A paper describes a structure:
The Ca2+ influx is mediated by [name], driven by membrane potential and using a uniporter mechanism. The [name] subunit comprises three structural domains: the transmembrane domain (TMD), the coiled-coil domain (CCD), and the N-terminal domain (NTD). The TMD of [name] is known to be responsible for Ca2+ selectivity and conduction, and each [name] subunit contributes two transmembrane helices to the TMD: TM1 and TM2.
In conclusion, here we report the structure of intact [name] supercomplex as a 20-subunit O-shaped dimer of hetero-decamers, with auxiliary [name] and [name] subunits attached. The overall structure forms an O-shaped ring and adopts the shape like that of two “goldfish”, as if glued together at both their heads ([name]/[name] dimer) and tails (NTD of [name]). A pair of [name]-[name] heterodimer appears like a bridge across the gap between the two halves of [name]-[name] complex. Within the MEMMS structure, we modelled 2 Ca2+ ions at the E264 sites ([name] has high affinity for Ca2+ (≤2 nmol/L), E264 site is constitutively bound to Ca2+ under physiological conditions), 8 cardiolipins (CDLs), and 16 phosphatidylcholines (PCs). There is no direct interaction between [name] and [name]. [name] and [name] form a heterodimer in a previously reported “face-to-face” pattern, while the two [name] subunits interact in a ‘back-to-back’ pattern. The negatively charged C-terminal loops of [name] protrude into the IMS and are responsible for direct interaction with [name]. The positively charged N-terminal poly-K (99–102) region of [name] and the negatively charged C-terminal tail (93–107) of [name] are in close proximity to each other, as shown by clear interactions between [name] G105, F106 and [name] E93, E101, consistent with a previous functional study which has detected interactions between these two oppositely charged tails. To conclude, the N-terminal domain and SKK sequence of [name] are important for its recruitment onto [name]/[name] complex through interactions with the C-terminal tails of two adjacent [name] subunits.
Residue numbers in the entry:
A (entry chain E): 48 to 101
B (entry chain C): 239 to 348
C (entry chain D): 239 to 345
D (entry chain I): 105 to 134, 145 to 160, 189 to 254, 276 to 445, 453 to 476
E (entry chain J): 83 to 211, 229 to 418
Amino acid sequence: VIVTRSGAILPKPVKMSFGLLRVFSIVIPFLYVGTLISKNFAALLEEHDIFVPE
Amino acid sequence: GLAYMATQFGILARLTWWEYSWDIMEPVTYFITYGSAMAMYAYFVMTRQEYVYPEARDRQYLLFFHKGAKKSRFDLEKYNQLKDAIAQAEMDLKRLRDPLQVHLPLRQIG
Amino acid sequence: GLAYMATQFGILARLTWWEYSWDIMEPVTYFITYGSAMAMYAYFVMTRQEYVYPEARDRQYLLFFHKGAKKSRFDLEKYNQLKDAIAQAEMDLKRLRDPLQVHLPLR
Amino acid sequence: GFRDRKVMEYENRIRAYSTPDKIFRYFATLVFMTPEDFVRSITPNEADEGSIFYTLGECGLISFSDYIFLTTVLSTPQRNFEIAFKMFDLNGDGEVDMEEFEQVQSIIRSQTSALTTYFFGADLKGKLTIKNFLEFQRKLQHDVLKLEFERHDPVDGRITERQFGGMLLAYSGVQSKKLTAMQRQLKKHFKEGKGLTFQEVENFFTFLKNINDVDTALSFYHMAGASLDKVTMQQVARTVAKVELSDHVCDVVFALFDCDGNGELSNKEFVSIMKQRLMRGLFTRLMQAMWKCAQETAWDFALPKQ
Amino acid sequence: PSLRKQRFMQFSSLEHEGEYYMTPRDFLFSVMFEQMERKTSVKKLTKKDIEDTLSGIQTAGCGSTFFRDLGDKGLISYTEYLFLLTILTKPHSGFHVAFKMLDTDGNEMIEKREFFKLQKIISKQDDLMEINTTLQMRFFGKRGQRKLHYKEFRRFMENLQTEIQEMEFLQFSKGLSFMRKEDFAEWLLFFTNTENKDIYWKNVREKLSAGESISLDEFKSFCHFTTHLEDFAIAMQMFSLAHRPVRLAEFKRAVKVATGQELSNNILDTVFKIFDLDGDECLSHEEFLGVLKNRMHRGLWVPQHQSIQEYWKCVKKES
Ligand SMILES: CCCCCCCCCCCCCCCCCC(=O)OC[C@H](COP(=O)([O-])OCC(O)COP(=O)([O-])OC[C@@H](COC(=O)CCCCCCCCCCCCCCCCC)OC(=O)CCCCCCCCCCCCCCCCC)OC(=O)CCCCCCCCCCCCCCCCC
Ligand SMILES: CCCCCCCCCCCCCCCCC[C@@H](O)O[C@H](CO[C@H](O)CCCCCCCCCCCCCCC)COP(=O)(O)OCC[N+](C)(C)C
Ligand SMILES: CCCCCCCCCCCCCCCCC[C@@H](O)O[C@H](CO[C@H](O)CCCCCCCCCCCCCCC)COP(=O)(O)OCC[N+](C)(C)C
Ligand SMILES: [Ca+2]
């Protein structure tokens, strides 16, 4: 809705201070952390002769 | 937004059936879907609203209105306090219908 | 929760291009999706309400508040009684000052 | 195997760049070197009784200076090597004494029982001449080329065209990531082909080594916008390199390199690559690469005349 | 019309049957002058004009001086222009190779059929988008049946190179037989690929003597060293390893052994007074080799509109 019960207008939507920066400062580092986790687990699995792709 | 959806559809189709095979283009689609699912959650995290089409449209309209009203220096506060007084006086007129037309006791506030 | 989604994206996208192939990782992704669906259903089974973002946030906030209130020996009952009595008294005062009636002089 | 893959990739990378001291320290015993370890260090991603390396194996462990001299004798062409020898000889008579050779080999000692027994006697007296010098040049080069040939598993004393193309593209350390596709296509392009006997690839490799003179010999084709050709390549290899080339080898080189062209193999296609690779004597693996790529792209974009 | 043909028709002076030609004076100007302003216009020719022009070679000296002797009564087409232009920068020990290259060995000498093959190469490169010049008349007789041996070829190429060196020497010495060290300094600094000659000018102001001269043979020897610089650097790369700066005596010995052109102490002293940026008496190969890298001096313009590409490569690689 864009108006109240009367003709008045709703207040301005409260935005978050530096929202996009605050979300991209969380997405990317944890993305790289997950990449590191995957690399280390794959290396540990292949070193002990458990799963080798080819 | 509709044009961008169509553009992405076209890009994926052209790169899937002409240049690169589907065996190369399936992971791209999966990760695009997952990224969309993650962005629809970041939207809620940072706006405290669930990503629904009409609610997003209303929020964007309100932001555009409250920017165009600041650019034009429109006395929005006076407008709101003037549109609430007409509403108050009409609710009072609606209340005054009982004791003046049908001779019934007046309804209380609320 | 957002950081968990991000790290899952990363841990799944690292394998399908560097170490393993998509022919190996596609069923893992499908079963992750189906497990997510099963978890979203178990959330409803347990909490008796559908899993949506704002309602889940509000439920978690209510649990946190009612735990902090017990950890600090807060008196929620007297607070609610006062918050209701204040509204009742304000309604009484607003009804007694009705401009349409003559409960009071013009002042 | 992924871990061994990245290990071999890093070893090949440190072989390609920062060679002089880093490689010599990267391969040793237990500060010296051994001949089989030298052969390992000179081959990417990797006892004789008839080879030169057998003679050094009989001799004591190789020194760092000896390693530098071996790199230079493998690198420089024949005429420049003769000039380098003439510069080695300090005295007038055309024979390098042990003392002057010791001086010009100690001049390289910067981080501060050798091949001498192959050049000099056990008394370390016998001076050599230019003839023995060039003989050792040719012997060592033919020997390392024979070892590389036999490392590729040969059939009937012959090697598949794809393997020869891979060896050639490996000689010029350029990773275009697209010339590999041409290497792969060469097999079907030469479906059921010949075996590329050792003498053919030997002649082609000596020609490629003697390209610094080939370039200036066909200088009229440059400065005129011309492009190479089969017969002209035959002629320039016969004249400058003084060796014959079978038509099949020129055909496979054309099929490998003339990608943009239509069988002409202009300067930028083939000759420039080898001319630049012969001059090797003069994440970080992203900045410079991207810079060069962007520079080339900008140049090609601005290429719209006046 | 490629860049080379554009330059050729810009510096040309004669046209005939829709084909631009050139006289030795224009070839010399194209070699020594970057840009020339032609006050007059091109003129056409007839067979009488052709004979009036070709009537000079009969009384011309086939010695060291051949082009200034011909003056303006000569004829040079595009193919001979490119051939001579490659001769200008061809080092020694490539003379015999170039000679054997210019003939399929069916003729141990060179008949005019091989120059016809050269012209055919040019025409094939052109189209895939009769007329006797002076050079053919010099190599081959007026009749056209004349064998050209290798010794005459080597003599002609040496004479052309020496003629160009004499021309540049007399152009930089204003006519005198002993140019000042400053003229040699500025001639060197012309083609060096640096942006601030201020340090070298400070060096020649401070270190170099107020008055000193250079002969002609010394200038020719230095030019021959400059044209063998590539082989010289190949020989010096072994010494550049370990990053050992070379002194003057070893520099002289090395240039003598690698290029056969022994230099005097004056030129070496001068080039070390201009190029020794550091305080030591001798400096490494870095400045001299890397800075004196082009060798494309003396005309030989390579105008592939490299201005903006150079600026872009500067902005990119500067780190
Ligand atoms: C190992 C391999 C893996 C690698 C992969 C890694 C990546 C995977 C993970 C992905 C997960 C990411 C999830 C996070 C993103 C989602 C965030 C979000 O939705 O926030 C909601 C957030 C909530 O909004 P709000 O708080 O109500 O205010 C929003 C407004 O409308 C704005 O305020 P207003 O009222 O002023 O608005 C005016 C109006 C119009 O805009 C304006 O005029 C406003 C802007 C003016 C600036 C004035 C204020 C500036 C102050 C800045 C604000 C503070 C800080 C933020 C700024 C810092 C930015 C860095 O705004 C709009 O139109 C909004 C729509 C924006 C759409 C633009 C999308 C562009 C995409 C283009 C597609 C490509 C084109 C093809 C090209 C063809 C080539 C030839 O919405 C936005 O912020 C919208 C911007 C975000 C873009 C849309 C979605 C992003 C999609 C992701 C792309 C990722 C890159 C992919 C790379 C691929 C791999 C290489
Ligand atoms: C001055 C103005 C100039 C503007 C110029 C820019 C024009 C383009 C701007 C971007 C337009 C955004 C409109 C919406 C984009 C495409 C529509 C999107 O929602 O489609 C979804 C695909 O999603 C997108 O690809 C990623 C989602 C990212 C959401 C954040 C966008 C930022 C919000 C911008 C505010 C304005 C939005 C207006 C929407 C009406 C479909 O996936 P689906 O399976 O069905 O998901 C379920 C949807 N449910 C939940 C509502 C049912
Ligand atoms: C005291 C400090 C605590 C520290 C704890 C830090 C770590 C805690 C965070 C761990 C995760 C908790 C939050 C989980 C939120 C992420 C899951 C969700 O956002 O992602 C979905 C994926 O789901 C997940 O993969 C599995 C969901 C299982 C539900 C778990 C129950 C969570 C209970 C705790 C709730 C906490 C509040 C959650 C805020 C929303 C998106 O996929 P999608 O397909 O598009 O779902 C559509 C959503 N619809 C239906 C509403 C439109
Ligand atoms: Ca699939």
